[PDB]
Structure 1
Amino acid sequence: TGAGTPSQGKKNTTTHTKCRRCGEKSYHTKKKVCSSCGFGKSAKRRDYEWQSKAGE
C-alpha cells in the first residue's frame, strides 16, 4: 500500500474544529485543546516570542 494517494482515502476523522474562545478552526475535539489560543490547556492566551523576528 502506497503512503501517498492510496492512504489519503481513510481520512474522515474529525480533529480540529471551530473554537469556542478564539474562533479559529483549531480546537482538537479529541484532545479538547486549542492549538491556536491554548484554550483547554491555559487560562492565558497562547503566545510566543518566536512568532516574529527577534528585534521586532
Structure 2
Amino acid sequence: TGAGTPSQGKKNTTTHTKCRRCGEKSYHTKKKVCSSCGFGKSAKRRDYEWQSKAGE
C-alpha cells in the first residue's frame, strides 16, 4: 500500500471544525482546541510575533 493516492481513501475523519470563538475552521473537535485562536487552550487569544517579519 503506497503512502500516496491509495492512503488518501481512508481519510474520512472530522477533526478541524468551525470555531465558536473566532469563526475559523480550526477548532479541533477531538482535542477541543482551536489551532487558530487558541480557544479551549487559553483565555487570551493565540498570537505570535513570528506571524510577521521581525521589524514589522
**The TM-score by the shorter chain falls in which range?**
over 0.9
TM-score, reference length from structure 1: 0.99
Q: Which runs of 4+ in 1 moved over 3 A?
A: none
Which blocks of at least 5 consecutive residues in structure 2 are unaligned? none
The structure richer in strand per residue is 1
Paired with 1:53 and 1:31, the residues of 2 have a C-alpha distance of 30
Q: Percent identity?
A: 100
- CA RMSD after TM alignment: 0.2
Could you list the per-position Cα deviations for residues 1-56 of structure 1 after superposition, in whole angstroms to 9, with x for gaps in the alignment? Answer: 00000000000000000000000000000000000000000000000000000000
